[PDB]
Write an enzyme that holds these catalytic residues in place. Structure first.
Site, short mmCIF file in Angstrom:
data_model
loop_
_atom_site.label_atom_id
_atom_site.label_comp_id
_atom_site.label_asym_id
_atom_site.label_seq_id
_atom_site.Cartn_x
_atom_site.Cartn_y
_atom_site.Cartn_z
N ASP A 1 15.33 3.46 -9.89
CA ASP A 1 13.89 3.44 -10.13
C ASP A 1 13.22 4.82 -10.17
O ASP A 1 12.17 5.02 -9.59
CB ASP A 1 13.20 2.55 -9.10
CG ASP A 1 11.89 1.99 -9.60
OD1 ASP A 1 11.04 1.63 -8.78
OD2 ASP A 1 11.71 1.92 -10.81
N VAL B 1 2.94 2.08 3.42
CA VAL B 1 3.40 3.25 4.13
C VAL B 1 2.19 3.96 4.70
O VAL B 1 1.20 4.16 4.00
CB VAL B 1 4.14 4.20 3.20
CG1 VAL B 1 4.56 5.44 3.94
CG2 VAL B 1 5.32 3.51 2.58
C1 LIG Z 1 9.91 8.82 1.69
S1 LIG Z 1 8.52 7.82 2.13
C2 LIG Z 1 7.06 8.71 1.79
N1 LIG Z 1 6.78 9.89 2.32
C3 LIG Z 1 5.61 10.24 1.83
O1 LIG Z 1 5.05 11.28 2.11
C4 LIG Z 1 5.14 9.24 0.98
C5 LIG Z 1 3.94 9.31 0.28
C6 LIG Z 1 3.00 10.34 0.32
C7 LIG Z 1 3.05 11.48 1.01
C8 LIG Z 1 1.98 12.29 0.84
C9 LIG Z 1 1.04 11.85 0.00
S2 LIG Z 1 1.57 10.35 -0.56
N2 LIG Z 1 6.08 8.30 0.99
#
Ligand SMILES: CSc1nc(O)c(Cc2cccs2)[nH]1
Length: 248
Positions: free
Chosen positions: A108, A11
């Site tokens: 989870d 991500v």
């Molecule tokens: C719902 S997907 C997702 N959004 C965010 O913001 C993350 C991970 C992080 C966001 C900010 C620091 S880690 N994963």
């Protein structure tokens, strides 16, 4: 067009070079069909928002939580201020009541999947493992192992089939335990596991329980119950003394 600023964990953070708005992009290259399906149903202030997707590699457009994961608000061996924990736990229950209300189990729940926004509001994140447990007012028992071992309910380890809801309630208990003690009680919930055995024997003079005030601990006594039918349900968690105990 969005620009990928950094890897969030794959991500990456995407920023609209026009609007300047931030979102989270999930990149998947050959379950994903169901993650999207499920995401499309979701709409709640305690669940990470689904914006859209595009099939170039499949791209998922998710709410960006600039607060990071809850995991990183837990001081190891310490936990966090009881009031912050209670607050996060309230929002966690709201998130869960909601999902359960529309027949969806996350499967989870753990601090790595509880993200925080700018006001430190808590969002349930990642439905990669989620599934439907109620459709047409008909409940389906779950038959597949899922989640992380420290947070998994015991019936999932010893039963052919089990109800979805108490499995999520159990995992929320472990999360509460983690928030209030900065440690996980056991590797997994089996009798082969000394630590889980000690809890069943009510040895609360040990870690992590001795680090936990007796109000929250009494709630944990009701959640971390081995028989999934005996285990407290969420409507009843909403009536627990500590849950309702005002905190500074
Ligand atoms: C719902 S997907 C997702 N959004 C965010 O913001 C993350 C991970 C992080 C966001 C900010 C620091 S880690 N994963």
């Amino acid at each position: 067009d969005w620009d990928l600023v950094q890897t969030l964990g794959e991500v990456q953070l995407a920023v609209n070079r026009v609007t300047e708005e931030a979102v989270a992009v999930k990149i998947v290259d050959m379950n994903i069909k169901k993650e999207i399906c499920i995401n499309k149903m979701l709409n709640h202030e305690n669940v990470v928002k689904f914006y859209g997707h595009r099939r170039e590699i499949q791209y998922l457009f998710l709410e960006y939580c600039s607060g990071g994961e809850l995991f990183d608000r837990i001081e190891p061996d310490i936990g966090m201020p009881e009031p912050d924990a209670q607050r996060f736990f309230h929002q966690l229950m709201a998130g869960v009541v909601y999902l359960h209300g529309i027949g969806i189990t996350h499967r989870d729940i753990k601090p790595e999947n509880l993200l925080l926004d700018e006001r430190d509001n808590l969002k349930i994140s990642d439905f990669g493992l989620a599934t439907v447990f109620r459709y047409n007012n008909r409940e389906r028992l779950l038959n597949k192992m899922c989640g992380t071992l420290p947070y998994v309910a015991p019936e999932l380890l010893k039963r052919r089939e089990f109800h979805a809801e108490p499995v999520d309630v159990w995992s929320c208990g472990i999360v509460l335990t983690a928030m209030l003690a900065g440690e996980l009680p056991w590797d997994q919930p089996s009798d082969s596991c000394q630590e889980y055995s000690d809890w069943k024997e009510k040895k609360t003079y040990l870690n992590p329980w001795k680090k936990i005030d007796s109000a929250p601990l009494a709630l944990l006594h009701k959640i971390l119950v081995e028989n999934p039918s005996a285990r407290i349900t969420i409507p009843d968690i909403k009536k627990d003394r500590w849950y309702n105990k005002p905190l500074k």
